[PDB]
Amino acid sequence: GSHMSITPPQIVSALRGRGWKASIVKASTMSSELKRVDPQGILKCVDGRGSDNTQFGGPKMPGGIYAIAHNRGVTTLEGLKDITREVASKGHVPSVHGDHSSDMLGCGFFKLWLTGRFDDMGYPRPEFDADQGALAVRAAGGVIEMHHGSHEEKVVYINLVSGMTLEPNEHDQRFIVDGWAASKFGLDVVKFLVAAAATVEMLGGPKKAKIVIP
């Protein structure tokens, strides 16, 4: 695994520098919401909407496993299938998602990536569309989740408590980012968090973060 190079207060500084409101929350203040990761839960998107998911307890990352491919600059279906099997072998059921309004283009993160909204940040675009990616993930043993409703995220939780995660609540929505999980998969963490913040910004999400720590 890789590790975080940056500290929580720096993350906060980084966010405030981007015009965000950000603070540090102690895991003890969330003893109730913080759930231990269940290896049977899908590693899914930070999306705060409800969905047909029945495999809870998995870590949250932008676009599900797309976050891993995005961070590493993996842009092929085969590479995506590699990542799908890698995730499955590291204690999590891999997945990507779409919704009922825009089908596979229902994942804000991937749409941003596919449409080049990450060009300015120097990210290689994927070499496949949302439909190809989803089917490729499925064929490699991954899950295709489907959301519904509208985005009503009120806050962004950047959880740094390893082995723990936060779940969606469609009636009181929030974006959830398990930063500790980027470390587990050897991603450039700073680079991952910045990508997550930019994702929320470009989707017009709430620029308010709560950084959860042990």
UniProtKB/TrEMBL annotation:
Coiled coil regions, renumbered to chain: none
Residues holding Zn(2+) 2: 45, 97, 107
Name the record gives this protein: Cadmium-specific carbonic anhydrase
Protein's gene: cdca1
First and last residues shown, out of full length: 407 to 616 of 616
